[PDB]
Amino acid sequence: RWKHTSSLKVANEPVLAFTQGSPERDALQKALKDLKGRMEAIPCVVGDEEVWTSDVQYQVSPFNHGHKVAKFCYADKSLLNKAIEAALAARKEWDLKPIADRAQIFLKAADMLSGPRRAEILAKTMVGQGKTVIQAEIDAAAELIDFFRFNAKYAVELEGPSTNSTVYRGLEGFVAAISPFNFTAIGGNLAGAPALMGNVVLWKPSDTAMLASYAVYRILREAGLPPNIIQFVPADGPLFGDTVTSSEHLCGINFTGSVPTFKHLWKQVAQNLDRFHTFPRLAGECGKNFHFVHRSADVESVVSGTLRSAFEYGGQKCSACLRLYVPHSLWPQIKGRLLEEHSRIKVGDPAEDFGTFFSAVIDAKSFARIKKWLEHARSSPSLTILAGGKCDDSVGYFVEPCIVESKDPQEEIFGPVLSVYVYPDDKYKETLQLVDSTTSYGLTGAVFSQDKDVVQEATKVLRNAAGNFYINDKSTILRWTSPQVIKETHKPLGDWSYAYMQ
Amino acid sequence: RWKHTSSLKVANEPVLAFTQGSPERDALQKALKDLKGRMEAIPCVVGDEEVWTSDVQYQVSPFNHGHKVAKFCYADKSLLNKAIEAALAARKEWDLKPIADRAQIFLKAADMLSGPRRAEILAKTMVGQGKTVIQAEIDAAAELIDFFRFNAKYAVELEGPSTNSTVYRGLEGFVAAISPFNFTAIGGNLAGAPALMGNVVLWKPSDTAMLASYAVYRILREAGLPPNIIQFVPADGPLFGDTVTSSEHLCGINFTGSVPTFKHLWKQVAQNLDRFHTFPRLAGECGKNFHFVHRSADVESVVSGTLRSAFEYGGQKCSACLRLYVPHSLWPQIKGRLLEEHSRIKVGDPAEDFGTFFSAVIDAKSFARIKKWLEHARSSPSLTILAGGKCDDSVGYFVEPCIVESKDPQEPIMKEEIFGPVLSVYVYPDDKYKETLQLVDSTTSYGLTGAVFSQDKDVVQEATKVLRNAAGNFYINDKSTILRWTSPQVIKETHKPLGDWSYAYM
C-alpha cells in the first residue's frame, strides 16, 4: 500500500587553502614532523590477523630516497589463497547486510578523513608519494572523501495485485582491486566501491603508496568495516594477477594502470574462463593528454593552464606527456611567457618548502625511464629542448621541468615534459584531425579559444580524443552489483488455458 | 541559470485478448492466410543495397516442415567486411544526431508494430517460429514494442566560475548483434539498443526467425532508420563470429545464446586484443529454471503455473527443463492434478487451431536433441516418465509434453540442455525442505528464473535469501516465465581567465 524511504543528500568536500596561519596548515606541519625520521611497519591484513612473510619491501621517500617511510611484505600464493577463502566465508553475510548499513561505514570513514585524520592522510601522501600540499589535498582528501560519500549516495538511491521489486546483489565470489602509484584516492575507490556493493575484495595496493594506502585501510576498519571484506595484501604484480586469475572464485577485477598490463590480465581470465563459477567483470582505467590552442586563445590562461597541466605532480597524473598545439601566430608570445615562467618554477622537498611547485618523481625505475627519454631525447633531429632537461638523483629522484618543441607532428614518460607543436594558423582544422588520429587511449584534453564556434567545432572533432574534455582550463558502481527482479502475485492463478483457445 | 530537462512518458504495451469476434483476432487470421503457401525471399541488406550470395538457406515452418516460409542467404567474409566499412562510414553522423531524433525513429517503429503491422509481425512469428497466438503476442508485440519505447525513454532521460555537462557518446566502431531462435523481441533489442545509443550494428539474425526478424528490420527502416546503421546480415555462426572478432573496428558484441558459444566469442576477442582500436564491450545473456513448492502452497496455482511454465512454447524459453520440487505431503495431490491436466493439453498446428497449447519445436537439430534426451532419460534407473514421451516428425517437429519423476536430486541429464517440453519432478520429504532449498542453490550454474510457491510468508522471505543467486528473475506464487552501449564524456568550460600557475599556500 505504501513504503518508508530514506535517501541521501551530500555536498562536495571543500578543498582547503592551507595559507599561512591556517588551522589546516599547522595541523599538516605537526603531521609531517611526526613522520620525519620514523618508518612504519605494514603487514598484510587478512581478516583481523596481521601477517608477515619472508618477502620484505621498503617504501622510500621520493625526494629523499634515503628515507624508508614504510616496511612491508609481499603476500605469497599461500597467503593470497588463504585471503580468498577467508573473504568468501564472509561474503554472504556482507551482501545480505542492508546497503544503508554498509553506506554508513563509508560515510563515517569519509568524515574521519574529512577532519581528524585529514592531516595524517595528507602527510603520508606527501612523504611517501612526493606530492605537494595542494596535490595531496585534492587527491587523498577531496577526491577520496567524495568517492566515499557519493558512492554511498548512488548505492542508497539505487535501492530507492502483482508486486514487483529489484534487489541489488553483490557478485558471487571475490573482486581483485589493483591500485596505481599516482593516486591515493583511486586505490581507496578501487577497493571501496566494489565492497560497498556487497562484495569482498583482495586489495593489492601500489608499492609506492603503501604508507597512505594502509592509512586509508585502517580508517575504513576503524569506521566499522568487518574483517575479511577487504584484505590488505601487498604483493608482486605478476604473482598477484597470476594467483587471482587462477581462482575459480574470481568474479571481478578492478584495475587502474597501463593498457599492456590490463590486456594481460584480460587474456589471463579468458584463458581460464572454463574454471570460473561466474563470468568475471573486468574494469580497467588505462593514457594521453593534449592542449589544443586556437588563434583566439587568451595567452595568460593558456600559459598557466599549460604549466599546471604539464608539471603538477611532475607530470605523473598522466602516462605520457602533455602535447601542446600552438598556432604559429601565437607561438612567439607563448614561447616567451612559458620560458619566463618556467625559470620561476621551484622543484624541491615538498615537506620543508611549501613553495615547491612539484617534487621528485615516484621512483628509480621511473627516474631511469625519464633519463633515457632525455639522453636519447637531446639526440632526435626533430626535437629541440627549449628548457630544462637536467635531472639529479643523488638525494631524491629529481627531474627539472622540461619543455620540448617538435617539428614532426607524430613523434609513456610519466615525467614533467611539455611537448610543443607549432602549426600554421590556416591549417588548424587539419591539425585538430591530427590530434584525433594521434590519440590511442586518450585520458584528457583541453581546447583554448575565445571563439565560441571554434569550441563547438573542436568538441565535435575531438569527441573521441578524450574522456574528460576541458574548455579554456587545464586538462587536469553498477558494475559491482547484479540486479535480481522479484515479482510477486497475490491472487491465485486460474486455468492454464487462455480465453482465445476456447 | 536555467535547466531544461525533457521527459518522455510511456506506458506498457497492452497484451490483446484475441477472443472470438475481436478485431485483432480477425486481423491475425487474415494475416495468416496471406502467408499460407507463399514464401519470402530475404536478401542481406548492407546500406540500402539488397545483396544475394551463392550460399542460399531456407526457413521452414516447424509444425509443417514441408513449408519453406523464407529463402535467404548467408553473408561471406567479403560481404561482412563491406558491411563493416559501410557502417563505420555512417557512424559519426549517426552518433552526432541528437538522441531525441534517434529515439523518434524507435518510437514510430513501436507504433507501427503496435497497430498497423502488429498482425503481420504476429503472423510471421507464428508461422516461422511455431508460436501460438498468445506467445507471439507477448514476444513479438508487447515485449519488442516495450523495448523500443522504454529504451527510447531511458536514453532521453539520460541526456536530461565554470559550467559542467555530460555527453553520451556511441562507442567508436561497430557492434555485432547475435540473436537467438526463441525470441523475436530479443533480436530486435540486440540490434536496436546499441543503435539507439549512436552505434552502428552488424545484425546476425537467427536462421529460424528470419521471416519475422526481417519484418522488424523493414519496419525500422520504414520508421526512419538511415542506411548502414543496422546491417541485416544473416550468416553462418562460426563464420560471422570469426569475421567480426577479427575486425580492428569491433567495439562491442551484443549476444544472447549458450554459455559455451559466448565463452568462445570472449576468448576470440581476448586473442585479438592487440588489434582493436578500443576495448570491445561484450554483453551476453546465457539458463535454468525451477519451481520450488512448499507444503503451504496452493495446489491449483502450482499446477497451472507449472504446466504453463514447463510447456508453453514447448519449453523453448529455457535451455534446461523445469525442475519442480514438491514436498512429499502434497505430491499425491499434485501428481494427480498434473496427470489429469496433462492429457487435456492439445499440441498441434497453431495457425489453424487456436486451441493449440503449444506446437512443434523449432527445428530438426532440436528435435533430434530432444529424442536423444528422452531416450537417455528413459533407460536411466532414476527416471520414470509419468506422462508423454512420444514425438513424431513426419509432418512437423512435434513432441508430446513429457513429465518425469526423479529419485536422484542430482540427476545428470537434468543438467544437460533440452529446450523441449519436459517437466522434471523431485519429491522431497517435508521435514527436509530447508536442505532442499540449498540443493536448488547448489544445483544451478547459470540460473535464468525460479519460482517459490508457498502461502507461508516467512518461508518466502527465507527462500528469497537462500535462492538469492539461483535466479536473476524470481517469482513468488506465479509461474517463472543500454548504458553498456554508451561511453560518457565530461565537458567543463571555464569562463573566467585562469591566473598564475602558483597557489595561495605557496
Q: What are chain A's domains?
A: 20-287+477-491 (3.40.605.10), 288-476 (3.40.309.10)
Map grid coordinates 605537494 to a residue. A132
A267 to B284: CB separation less than 8 angstroms, yes or no: no
Residue of B40, B85, B159, B285 marked catalytic? B285
Specify the long-range contacts of residues B36-42, CB closer than 8 Å, at least 24 apart.
B36/B351, B39/B67, B39/B68, B39/B69, B39/B70, B39/B71, B40/B69, B40/B70, B40/B71, B40/B211, B40/B214, B41/B70, B41/B71, B41/B72, B42/B70, B42/B71, B42/B72, B42/B210, B42/B211, B42/B214, B42/B234
Question: Residue B249 forms beta bridges with which residues?
Answer: none
Map grid coordinates 608570445 to a residue. A333
Whole-number Å distance between alpha carbons of A458 and A470:
11
B38 CA to chain A: closest CA distance, Å? 26
A500 to B18: CB separation less than 8 angstroms, yes or no: yes
Whole-number Å distance between alpha carbons of A6 and B437:
33
CB pairs under 8 A between A and B: 176
Strands of the A250-256 sheet, one edge to the other: A49-51, A44-46, A230-232, A200-204, A174-178, A250-256, A281-285
Q: Is A472 on the interface with B (CB under 8 A)?
A: yes
Question: Residue B40 forms beta bridges with which residues?
Answer: B70
Whole-number Å distance between alpha carbons of A273 and A279:
7
Whole-number Å distance between alpha carbons of A323 and A346:
22
Q: Which helix (H) or strand (E) holds B307?
A: helix B299-311
Whole-number Å distance between alpha carbons of B472 and B450:
8
Q: Could you tell me the three cell numbers for B47? A: 546500406
Q: Is B58 on the interface with A (CB under 8 A)?
A: no
Q: Could you tell me the three cell numbers for B383? A: 527416471
Residue window 417-446, chain A: list those with CB within 8 Å of chain B: 440
Name every residue whose Cβ is closer than 8 Å to that of residue A63 and which is 6 or more positions away in sequence.
A130, A348, A349, A350, A351, A359, A360, A395, A396, A397, A398
Cα–Cα distances in angstroms (integers) from residue A244 to residues A200, A206, A233, A239, in the given order: 13, 17, 12, 9
Which residue in A353, A315, A396 sits closest to A69, CA to CA?
Answer: A396
Q: Pick the residue from chain A with its C-alpha nearest to B167.
A: A463
Whole-number Å distance between alpha carbons of A305 and A448:
10
Burial track A376-403 (b if 16+ CB lie within 10 A, e otherwise): ebeeeeebeebbbbebeeeebbbbbbbb
A141 CA to chain B: closest CA distance, Å? 16
Q: Pick the residue from chain B with its C-alpha nearest to A455.
A: B493
B494 to A471: CB separation less than 8 angstroms, yes or no: yes
Whole-number Å distance between alpha carbons of B134 and B28:
12
Burial track B326-340 (b if 16+ CB lie within 10 A, e otherwise): bbeebbeebbebbee
Question: Residue A432 forms beta bridges with which residues?
Answer: none
Classify A487 as helix, strand or coil. Answer: strand
Q: Is A58 on the interface with B (CB under 8 A)?
A: no
Question: Residue A228 forms beta bridges with which residues?
Answer: none
Q: Pick the residue from chain A with its C-alpha nearest to B284.
A: A279
Whole-number Å distance between alpha carbons of A203 and A217:
10
Which residue in B233, B218, B235, B187 sits closest to B82, CA to CA?
Answer: B233
Name every residue whose Cβ is closer than 8 Å to that of residue B489 and which is 6 or more positions away in sequence.
A463, A466, A467, A468, A469, B166, B167, B168, B169
Q: Which residues of B touch A21 (CB under 8 A)?
A: none
A218 CA to chain B: closest CA distance, Å? 29
Q: Could you tell me the three cell numbers for B429? A: 520429504
DSSP state, residue B175: E
A18 to B500: CB separation less than 8 angstroms, yes or no: no
Q: Is B18 on the interface with A (CB under 8 A)?
A: yes
Map grid coordinates 514510430 to a residue. B108
Whole-number Å distance between alpha carbons of A136 and A420:
28
Name every residue whose Cβ is closer than 8 Å to that of residue B460 and which is 6 or more positions away in sequence.
B452, B454, B476
Whole-number Å distance between alpha carbons of B12 and A51:
57
Please report, in range form, the residues annotated as the binding site of A for NAD(+).
Answer: 179, 204, 257-261, 412
Map grid coordinates 519475422 to a residue. B212
Cα–Cα distances in angstroms (integers) from residue B82 to residues A215, A278, B86, B177, B281, in the given order: 56, 36, 6, 17, 22
Q: Could you tell me the three cell numbers for B112? A: 507501427
Are B122 and B140 in contact by the 8 Å Cβ rule? The answer is yes
Whole-number Å distance between alpha carbons of B420 and B317:
9
Q: Pick the residue from chain A with its C-alpha nearest to B442.
A: A277
B134 to A492: CB separation less than 8 angstroms, yes or no: no
Resolution, in Å, please? 2.8
DSSP state, residue A347: B
Which residue in A328, A330, A337 sits closest to A422, CA to CA?
Answer: A328
By Cβ distance, the residue of A271, A472, A500 closest to B494 is: A472
B428 CA to chain A: closest CA distance, Å? 24
DSSP state, residue B140: I
Active site residue B318: yes
Question: Residue A231 forms beta bridges with which residues?
Answer: A202
Count of Cβ atoms closer than 10 Å to residue A23 Cβ: 9
Q: Which helix (H) or strand (E) holds A23?
A: helix A23-33
Cα–Cα distances in angstroms (integers) from residue A289 to residues A64, A94, A335, A457, B419, in the given order: 29, 40, 20, 19, 52
User: Any idea which residues of A carry the catalytic annotation?
Assistant: 285, 318
Please report, in range form, the residues annotated as the binding site of B.
Answer: 179, 204, 257-261, 417
B353 CA to chain A: closest CA distance, Å? 8
Mutation pick from A93, A468, A501, A502 vs chain B, by most beta carbons of B within 10 Å, is: A501
CA atoms within 13 Å, Cβ hemisphere of A19? 5
Q: Is beta strand B402-406 parallel, antiparallel or unpaired with respect to B422-428?
A: parallel
Farthest-apart Cα atoms in chain A, separation: 93
Q: Which residues of B touch A300 (CB under 8 A)?
A: 497-499
Whole-number Å distance between alpha carbons of B424 and B408:
11
Are B69 and B60 in contact by the 8 Å Cβ rule? The answer is yes
A494 to B304: CB separation less than 8 angstroms, yes or no: yes
Are B425 and B326 in contact by the 8 Å Cβ rule? The answer is yes
Q: Which residues of A touch B497 (CB under 8 A)?
A: 298, 300-301
Q: Is B281 on the interface with A (CB under 8 A)?
A: no
Q: In this structure, is the dihedral angle defined by the CA atoms of residues A304, A305, A309 and A310, taken in order, positive or negative?
A: negative
Strand stretches in B174-332, DSSP E: 174-178, 200-204, 230-232, 250-256, 281-285, 290-293, 322-327
